[PDB]
């Protein structure tokens, strides 16, 4: 189910859209990683996007501490299902989550076979 | 209030994001137009985006008939408030709404001073 | 340079790329208009993109006067010739040009069936 | 052509543009890696973008062998030098290259503080 290591506060969400069909990208695998002091990527949270191309409950507020996180979207598998040959191996978003900055993090990604865009909406409220 | 000519079914919605600050673009004016047979743009619906950068209730299902619609976002005013000199006069999205194709229309726009992207998510459910 | 009506130093250039195929968008029709005194769009220049997805020689520096211009890219015909039913009728770029001296404008567009991004690169001439 | 380690026919090129200023992204650090046999990223090539926001001569056609490569763009340092606190640490592009013959790869990136788009243009060489 479109959730990860924290069905609660939802301080981090991922939304994936398909720019070829103009629909959400459903069942896309997403793996979230946290950088360890030994500077390697330790698995953190993961899941498959829902029917609306969203993924929530990846983490919890108490678990989501300041650090460097990497969100990796398996775009290649998604396009392969569609019978379309892609260019990227996957799409990744590497960022520093800080405490002073706003609360919630929505990472959106818009996919095309040879292109992808990603934006971050950082705010304080709900949705 | 972030609504237009139809606080009901919500067959058409507009979401605007600011890629410079990573927040929704609030209070952006949007004017929706419908093409008349005399092929001119007749005003249709309009509004200002909410705190979450969204605009709903622009129209109603019975009003939203097949045709060519133009969504015009006043990006220039938005950037001027921010004290940033923009390039575009505004951003526009011209499209043909058909009945066989999926139900709801979400038009999203991501703004930067010298660039803008727009995508359409056409589906059948809710959100 | 090549004055009168041709690329003196090519003050206006358009570059179009196909995001589904990883290639330049070839043979795309482009129409440029200029806001006329009476507040209407007068035909200014037109062309088709080359093998490199580019269009040069649309105007000259002497004719490219201060004004509001609209670059219209026939995205629809392009996608249709490919067997794809796009979402937008066209992509339009509206901007004020040369209001504080002659500049060189490169308008780029990245195309996907349900999405397009546009970017402007403005350069202050010399030789 | 210029073999050994230089742009024989420039099989790999990177182009970076600034979406906030309408200009090429100058002096941006770029690091290319290649997936090593042991499944780790080995340093392949590096450079900084020129005045045109471009980077050529990163490799040669004889050395640019079949493999999985990662183009890392130091977006963070760029935005910071400008007095802007960006969201991402960098922008990364991961792809398989030359698996069915040598191709020419142009990797473009459009940068905004909280957003970036990336596009690949693949060409089949000749002369």
Curated annotation (Swiss-Prot), chains A, B, C, D:
Consequence of changing residue 47 to V: In AMYLD1; amyloid polyneuropathy with carpal tunnel syndrome
Effect of substituting residue 58 to R: In AMYLD1; amyloid polyneuropathy
Modification type Phosphoserine: residues: 52
Amino-acid positions noted as binding L-thyroxine in the UniProt annotation, renumbered to this chain: 15, 54, 117
GO BP: any one term: negative regulation of glomerular filtration
Protein modification: Not glycosylated under normal conditions. Following unfolding, caused for example by variant AMYLD1 'Gly-38', the cryptic Asn-98 site is exposed and glycosylated by STT3B-containing OST complex, leading to its degradation by the ER-associated degradation (ERAD) pathway. Sulfonation of the reactive cysteine Cys-10 enhances the stability of the native conformation of TTR, avoiding misassembly of the protein leading to amyloid formation.
Phenotype for residue 36 to P: In AMYLD1; amyloid polyneuropathy
Entry GO CC: azurophil granule lumen; extracellular exosome; extracellular region; extracellular space; protein-containing complex
PTM-bearing positions, type Sulfocysteine: 10
Effect of residue 47 to A: In AMYLD1; amyloid polyneuropathy
Pfam family of the protein (one): Transthyretin
Impact after mutating residue 10 to R: In AMYLD1; amyloid polyneuropathy
Phenotype upon changing residue 50 to R: In AMYLD1; amyloid polyneuropathy
Protein family (similarity comment): Belongs to the transthyretin family.
Protein name as it appears in the record: Transthyretin
């Amino acid at each position: 189910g479109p959730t990860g290591t924290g069905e609660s506060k939802c301080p981090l969400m991922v939304k994936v859209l398909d720019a070829v069909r103009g629909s959400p990208a459903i069942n896309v695998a997403v793996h979230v990683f946290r950088k360890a002091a030994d500077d390697t990527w330790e698995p953190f949270a993961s899941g498959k996007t829902s029917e609306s191309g969203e993924l929530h409950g990846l983490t919890t507020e108490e678990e989501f501490v300041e650090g460097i996180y990497k969100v990796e979207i398996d775009t290649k598998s998604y396009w392969k299902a569609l019978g379309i040959s892609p260019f990227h191996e996957h799409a990744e978003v590497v960022f520093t989550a800080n405490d002073s900055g706003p609360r919630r993090y929505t990472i959106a990604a818009l996919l095309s076979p040879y292109s992808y865009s990603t934006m971050a909406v950082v705010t304080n409220p709900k949705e």
